[PDB]
């Protein structure tokens, strides 16, 4: 059946012509990635060759800053986890203290069937609430120490290398501007090719639809 195959032919023909774009749109994005990559390294080398001692001397400071960025997130999460651990023990103390007066000696005996049901639930949680609160608190002592200790090294190094630091700041930022640009080009290249794989994939599926259709026509009469 001449129409049966021509329906897959043009379905295959449109898919393979789309690939010719994708192969260029990838190669173009790939080459531009190469071009920015090589310019990034040569403009940064000239900046090192001028005055590059400041760069190596600044590395102990920037590492001491890298350590600090970590310790401050650790301290913040320990801060927020301690803020939660206090709020549970409080709600457990408020629940118990409020329920204590009503039930003790049963001077009031109102909803006395229901009050303990909340008090005993509270009684059980306090055992764990006090465990976990002391836990997060002690960890908060560790992290807040590590935090304000990592700052002390960075600050003292800032005093000890402030000259080298102020000269390497333009170097790191032109490196960062180029990085994020390269990061931008790296992202565009990576998904543009996977887009082609799904394009090539849908092309190869046509060659099987034809391998079967021609086989379906053949097994007729």
Residue numbers in the entry: 41 to 261
The authors write:
Because computational secondary structure prediction assigned the N- and C-terminal regions as mostly disordered regions, we selected the central helical region for crystallography. We found that the R260A/R261A/R262A triple mutation reduced the degradation and obtained diffraction-quality crystals. This construct of SH3BP5 (41–266; R260A/R261A/R262A) is hereafter referred to as SH3BP5-RA. In addition, the M167A mutation was introduced to improve the solubility of the selenomethionine (SeMet)-labeled SH3BP5-RA (SeMet SH3BP5-RA/M167A), which was used for phase determination by the single-wavelength anomalous diffraction method. Finally, we determined the crystal structures of SeMet SH3BP5-RA/M167A in two different crystal forms (I41 and P41) and native SH3BP5-RA at 3.35, 3.6, and 3.8 Å resolutions, respectively. The asymmetric units of the I41 and P41 crystals contain one and two SH3BP5 molecules, respectively. Therefore, we obtained five different apo-SH3BP5 structures in total (i.e., one from I41 SeMet SH3BP5-RA/M167A, two from P41 SeMet SH3BP5-RA/M167A, and two from P41 native SH3BP5-RA). Although these five apo-SH3BP5 structures exhibit a similar V-shaped conformation, the superposition of these five apo-SH3BP5 structures using α1 as the reference shows some flexibility of the conformation. The hinge region of the V shape contains staggered hydrophobic interactions so as to maintain the V shape.
